[PDB]
Structure formats: structure tokens, C-alpha cells
Symmetry: C6
Subunit: 198 residues, 6 copies
């Protein structure tokens, strides 16, 4: 019922408010932005159309935060870069695949989680085909993997009025009552968010 406006010392963050947000000055220090994991094949193919697997296979995609594993069927015919990209994207597995032409007639496969957060980090495993498993597999606890981490999963980390706060997201509306905090950048020095009763 009670409306408020916000002002910020930096482009590093802004904020909007729901009703009944507490007016006043908030000291905000942002030390890390949330990041969505991206895994990229450490090796390349010379095209997007040649099958990589010789058998049909099953891709398992498992995220953290107690989410259900998704198993996708990939026929030998569809074990090409395009085939796998399409099969992942069509699965709606909370991850998204794309192809990168890195030049020199070489292509990489990238898989990115749709949501930022440590809990949105992912495991990828392929059963029923060695070549594809070793091309595309990723397990953080394995020494050799087909994927490398090109973008680390990461949580936002900030302090608000000296209270330490971690969050899966750079859009934070679950931490502070009736405030939504949007993090655009890590901060330096004293930065403040000002909330005034209308």
C-alpha cells in the first residue's frame, strides 16, 4: 500500500520495490556476479553434419540443486554436431546448446545452463558410445572430460548493510523484503542504494 522510489550511487546495481519496502540508505558491496555454466567441447569437428557416434546412445544431463536428470536419445545418424544441438535444444532440459565455428574449418559444441547459479552447474554423460562420451562428456570429478568449463557457474555474492548474501541470480528479489536488486557489476568502495517513501 506504501510506494517507494530508489536511487543508486553506481550503474553497478539498481533496484525496484514492491509495496511497504523500508525507506532509507542501504550500503551495498557486490563482490561477484552470478554466472551460468558453459561447457565447450575441448576438441573440434571439421563439420556439423557427420555423425560422431557409431551406435545409438543416451545423453544424460543432470543439474545440481536436487533437479531430476534428463535422458535424451541420440541415434547414430543424429550424433552429428547439428544432430546433438537439435536434440538437446528440443529436450527443454534447462540447458541450451549451440555450435561455434572457431575458424580454420573447425566447429565446437557449447552447452550452457539457462539459469545462473552454482546449483545450475551440470553433468553430461553419454552411455552406449565411447567416441561421443569422450567428445562431449563432462563430470567435475573426472580427470579427463570431453567438455571444458568455458564459463564457471557462479553465485552472486554481496553484502547489504553488512549482511552477507549469496544468490543463484543477479536478479535478486528473494533476499530482501519487498526489494528487487539487479546486479550489473562488481563494485568498488562505498556504494549505496537509497530508498525513499513517496
Amino acid at each position: 500500500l506504501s510506494a517507494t522510489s530508489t536511487t543508486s550511487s553506481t550503474t553497478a546495481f539498481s533496484a525496484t520495490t514492491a509495496g511497504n519496502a523500508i525507506a532509507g540508505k542501504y550500503t551495498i558491496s557486490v563482490t561477484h556476479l552470478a554466472q551460468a555454466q558453459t561447457l565447450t567441447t575441448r576438441t573440434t569437428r571439421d563439420d556439423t553434419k557427420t555423425a560422431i557416434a557409431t551406435s545409438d546412445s543416451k545423453l544424460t544431463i543432470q543439474q545440481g540443486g536436487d533437479k531430476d536428470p534428463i535422458t535424451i536419445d541420440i541415434s547414430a545418424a543424429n550424433s552429428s554436431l547439428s544432430g546433438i544441438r537439435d536434440a538437446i535444444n528440443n529436450a527443454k532440459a534447462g540447458v541450451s546448446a549451440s555450435i561455434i565455428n572457431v575458424g580454420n574449418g573447425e566447429y565446437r559444441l557449447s552447452v550452457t545452463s539457462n539459469d545462473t547459479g552454482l546449483d545450475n552447474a551440470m553433468t553430461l554423460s553419454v552411455s552406449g558410445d565411447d567416441a561421443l562420451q569422450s567428445f562431449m562428456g563432462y563430470d567435475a570429478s573426472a580427470s579427463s572430460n570431453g567438455m571444458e568449463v568455458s564459463v564457471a557457474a557462479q553465485n552472486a555474492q554481496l553484502t547489504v548493510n553488512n549482511v552477507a548474501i549469496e544468490n543463484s541470480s543477479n536478479t535478486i528479489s528473494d533476499a530482501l523484503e519487498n526489494i528487487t536488486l539487479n546486479l550489473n557489476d562488481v563494485t568498488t568502495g562505498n556504494q549505496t542504494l537509497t530508498i525513499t517513501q513517496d
Copy 2:
């Protein structure tokens, strides 16, 4: 009856005037802003709904400056984080409670005094339940407390024409005759407030 306008060398302070304010140049140096105390539970709960107390209990909130103590009743059922927040906020005890989700499935309770000032610092004590007392109690003279100080209570401190001035508030209209001083920031070097007869 006599109107005046104000000008300031810094965004650090501004000022407005009542009638018959004395025209001229005032040298203003601000060394500290007033602050409202915030106490935050040093420990967390994994949710906002589970009762913390096993008995019914009585929360005492005592501010300084010779204000009356307020005692609030908290049933065992209402000794949850939400319960306590609601009970404090509903009491109109000159303090305001909020819940902070610090991430990792953990929640803190914060209590803030509505007014800035050393005299608005607060003591919190709970009788009739050990767990809640040790979760949420705060006494500045005790070695172990449930609260920590996340925002120190603090008085504004400034000098006006070399006269030292302390104030509970950053909105100062009781210090200088017919002037209201608004402090937005601590200053550096020579800063002046200019008052001219209209």
C-alpha cells in the same frame, strides 16, 4: 516574516530556512552521519515457519534516551522467524523487523530502530525461553549475544562556524535557529553553506 535562500558548496549537505534566519556564510564540516542501529541474528534458520521456542515467551525491547520498555508476547507457535517479525512489527515498538534470505537455504532476522541516534540503540531480551533468548537476545554489556550489530547506532557530528554539534538525526532543525540542515554525506576540506536575504 523575512525570507531567505540557501546555497551549498557540496551535495554533502543542503539546507532550507524558516523565517528570520541570519543571512551569510556558514562554514560546515560534517565528520559523521547519524545511523540507526541494526541488529542481525548471528545464526540462521533453514526456514521462516518453524517455531524456535518450545514455551511461550516475552520479548522485551528497550531503547535508550529514557524511553519506556515494550514487552511483547510470543507464543511457542509464533516463535518462528515469520511469527517474531510479525509480532515485533505489529507492536509499534519504535523498531522494525525484517527477514533476510542470505542464500544457501538460510534466513536471518534483522531488527532496526526506526530513528537514527545513539539514544535509539536497543536492548532485546526474551524471558521464558532459552533457545529464543540465545537466538535473538542483545545486550551491549553481555559477552555472548544472539544478535550482532550490523549497523552501529551513531550520531551526526558536524561543526558550524567552528561550533561543535552532535545530533541524533541527519535532518537537523533543532540545532541552528530557523535553519534546517540535511546531511547527505561526510565532507572533505572547506565547505560552506550560503544564506542570503531575499
Copy 3:
């Protein structure tokens, strides 16, 4: 009969002209601004209403520059901070009194001369009551005084085309023929005032 316009290298000074002012470039260096003396009670009262004197008394206010002394009557009843402030202000004694709440439940009395200038420095003496004399007395040649100097009386000091000039005022229209010089700040380096025939 002959009109002129002025330009200045700095916000430190500006100038306007009467008729027949001599066109050209004036090198101006300002080393000191004029100041109005302010005396402030070195001690405080805990309120503005309690009488300070036990007898009726006579406040003498004597400025320099061969001005007449003004003697004001202050009954014991009116020897409160408010009482004295009112009695001074009502006297039109070329000085002006105000009360400062310095915080911590303490009040100071300030007396300021209305005009800047060394010659507007003041002596304050109270006969017929020790307490008030020692609270509020000021004599520059006495070792102990009730007042301290919080703002030194001071003359403007500048040089115009290498001619040294002293003045009671920062509004100087008696130094240079047909020019009024307004001093806002002390200068650094070569600053010039330009006067051109219209």
C-alpha cells in the same frame, strides 16, 4: 554618463561599475576575506529558560572603530539564555545573538557582529552579576573569558594593480573610483578583472 561592463577570470570575485569607471585590465589578488566576529559561550546550559544571574545586571556591548558603547538591562528573571538572546536582539546594538543546541541536551549562546571588519570586533561585559559575567563576558585582553572567538573578525586584503588594499567589507565600493568589487573567495595565481567601455 559613460557606461562600462565587467568580466572576471574567477568566480572568486566579480564587479559592477558606476558611470565613468576607467576601462581596462586590472590584476586582482585576494589574500583574505573580511569576516564578522562571532563569540560563543565556552560553556553550555542544559536549558534556555533557567536564569543564570541571581541579581539584575547590565550588559555592555562595545565595538571598535570609535562606536558608542550600548548598555542593556537584564533582570535576574531574564538572565536565561532565551532572555539574554531576546534582550540583545531587541537592543539593535549592531550585534545579533542566537542560541545553538549543540546536542547532548546542551545549549550555547552565540553573539555575532552584523558587519564584517576588524573594527567591528566586540567587547562584552556584565556588571552586577559574577555568574553571568563569567558565562558571557569577553575582553580580548583578559586571560579568562566566558566567550571564545569562534569566528575571528577579519578585514578583506587584496592587491589591485599591485596596490595593497584593506577593507572592513567584502563588498568594496569605496576603494576604487566608480567600481564595486564583490569578494567571494581568496584567489590563486594571476586573476584579472576586465572593464570595457560600452
Copy 4:
């Protein structure tokens, strides 16, 4: 079907998107711009009209990237600077010739590949005339050549979300799905491209 807008931290790069481009923040670091090879005659002629060859001859222009060689006929009469420039330009050989008057009554011949890229580097060889071969020949593996490299052929080199990318062009719309990257400059520090769903 899904539209997106782009924002960039630097004038060093910009970007536009086709439909269904993945929203979000891309960290982009550009270390090299693509360049089109330019070869310039190390010696000069004193005019553009005198034939250089005494026999008719055949200019061969061979680019990399498995492109077909183009052989051009140059009569002795047309072995002048103007003659050769016209014959090259008229051939549409994926290269472009121009004359540079370097002053002092001297002229150079420049040949530039129309497309940037290492693969667009070129070999020039003239059969049937020594003078013209030694004036204008270029082979990267020969110790003495008529041409010098005045602009090295070069590939764009950048990294996008830590993925290394090489490209023949500074207009890159084949590397990243549904994005066109335009490189105007090499970057310094953290620069980012922002893509937001409309």
C-alpha cells in the same frame, strides 16, 4: 521469431542479431583485426605510360584457400603502369590494383586483395618477361620479389566467453549462432556485449 537487442561496452565492437539469438552477457576480447593483403612495387617508375615489358606476357594471380588461379594477358604495349592497373582491374580477379604517386616524379603499383583474410593472401607471377616479373612478381617463399608486403594479410582473432575464434573477416556472422559481430578495433581489458530478449 524471437527478436533481440544488443549493447556493447566499447566502440571496438558492435553486433546485430537474427531471430532466436541467445540473450545474455558475452565477454569479448579482440586481439587482432582481419586485414586484406596489399602488395606494393618496391621500385618506382617515372611515369604511368611507358611500357615496362619488351615482350607480351602473362600475369598469374593466385590466392589461397583453394581458389582458382587467374591468368591475364598483358601485351608489351600494355605493360605500362596504367596498362597493368587496367588489365588487373578489368580481370575481376578478386584483387584490385591502383597507382600511387609517391612524389618526386615517381609512381608505385599497389595490388590489394578485395577480401581480408590469411587465405586471401596472393601470389603474383609474370611469364614471358624478366623486367616485369622482377618489377611486380610476388612469392612469399622467394628471397627476392618485385612486390613488398605493405599491408599483411591477417585474420581476426577474438575470444567469446573464453572460446577462441579465428575469422577471415571483421564482419563475423558465421562464428556465433544468429549473431553478427562487427569488429572495429582491438580491445583492452574486460569488454562485454549484451544481448537482451525484446
Copy 5:
């Protein structure tokens, strides 16, 4: 008949042109501005109305550059500061007198030549009265004088396309054909005046 426009690299100088001025770039370096001599009485009077001379006297004002000497009659009655100022100003002697109130109840007499230039420096001599001669006399070759030089006479000194130029004036339209140069300031480094045919 042929019009031209001017552009300048600095506010230090500008320029306008008569017809048929030579278009092009002029390198201008200004090392000194012309100055008009000002002489000021080294001593002061405590007022402007008391006669200084006891006899009637004759003030001689002699400038350089082969100008005629002007002799002015000053009665004893008119040997006051106001008297002398009026008598000088009324003489139209190519000099101008003014009174300066330097503060502390003291007044100085200043005499300034109307034109800048070394050749506009002046000698002042009073016959028939010792007091006034010693108050107000000035001769550059005498060891003791009544005047001091508060503003040195000085010539503009500049170089235009490496040609050294001296001038009595900061408004220079007699040095360069069909150009008027206005000097506002001494320069630093390479500064240029650009003249382009319209």
C-alpha cells in the same frame, strides 16, 4: 576587394582582416603584452580634501616618444588629493588620475597613462613646492621619488612566422599588412592564426 576570415588556436589572440590580406597559416608566439604605466604615491594622506602644498605650484607631465610636455597650475588650495586628481583629469594630458582608498583611513594617488607602451611612460615634476614634489614627483633616473611604479610601461612582443615584432599596443594593425591582431594573453607552445580566402 578580397574578403578573408580568421581562426585562432588560442583565446590568447584573435584577428580580423581588411581587404586583400594574404590567406594562410601564421605561427604566432606572444611573449609579452603591452602595458600602460601606472604611478602610485608611495605615501598616503589621511584625507582627500587637505591641501598638501603651502604655495601655488606647477605640475609638469612629460611622456616619451617625443611628445610635448604639459604644465598644469595647482593653487595651494587645490593641492589636495581631490584637487590634483581633478586638475590632472581636466588637463587632458594623455594621463588619467584616480584616488585609491587603501583602507585604514589612508588614500593614495594613482596616475596612469591612457596608452600602453614604453614610449608612453611618464615623468612628473612639480616646481614651486617641496612637499608636493616629494609626494608626487616621478623621474626614472632619480633615486628617491614620490611615485613608485605600480604597473610597468611595457611593449607587446611577439613573433609572426618567425619575424620578431614590437608594438606599443595590444591592438596591432600597423605591423602586418591588412590584418589586425588583438593580443589577450601571452602564449605557450605552437599557436597559429589561420586566414582563409572567403
Copy 6:
């Protein structure tokens, strides 16, 4: 037939294009601007009207770059500064004469070539009169001359895409095909001229 637009990183140069100019980025480094020689008499006259020669004489003006010598007749009567200036200017000899009043009642004669360029440097010789020859003669290979060089003749020197270019002029439309380069200043670091097909 094909139109193009130009952009430049610096005010140091700009450019416009004729049809069919080659689109793209040109790296331009300017190390020297072209200059027109100016010769100035090392000695002065005290006026512009007194003849310098006692006999009639013949002034020869010879520029470089294989231009024809121009011989001008100067009667003894017309051997004044004004006389010689008029006679030179009226000859249309590709040079232009002016008089400079250097102050102190002294005048110099300046002769400037109308075109910039090393090839527009000049020799001046007077036959039939010693005084005028020694006043005004200039030969770069002679040890004593009447003229000094106050502005060196000089060629523009720049590099375009690493190709070294010399030019008599700062308006260069004969060096690069279908481009006109205007040089306003010597450059520092990487500067580029951008040409884009419309």
C-alpha cells in the same frame, strides 16, 4: 559512378573522394606539413618611402622545379620598400611581397612563394645595384645574403598504408586514386582514414 564517404580519427587530416574510390581503412601517419618559403630582409629600413638603390636595377626571381626566371625592372626612384613590394606584387611572379613594421620605427621586407613545396623555394638577385642586392638578395649557396629564411620551404611527408609519400602540397589529390587528402597537422600514434561505399 560509385559514391563514397570519409571519416577520420583526427582533426589532423580529412579527406573527400571522387567517384570509384576504394572503400576501406587507411592507416595515415603525417610527419611533416608542406610549407611555402618566406624570405625576410635581415636588416630594416626606417621608412617605406626612401629609395634604397642609387641606380636603376633588375630583380631576378627564380623558383625551382624547372620554372622560368622572372626579371623585374626597378628604377632608383622605385627602390623603396613600397616601390619594391608593388613591383614584385604587380609582376605575378608566383611570389608575393609584403612589408612588416617590426616596431621601433623599423620595417622589413618579406617575400613569400604562393605555393608550398621544396620546388617552390626561390632565388632573388638584383643586378645593377650593390646596396639593393645586399639588402634583398637571396641565394641558398651564398654565405652572405640580404634575406634570411624565416619560413623554410618544405614538402608534406606522410605514409598511407605503409606507403611513403612526398608532396609539394597539403592538399593532396594526385597521390591516391580518387581521394583528396587535406593535411592540417602532423599526427601522433595510429590514425586512420575510413572510406565507406555509400
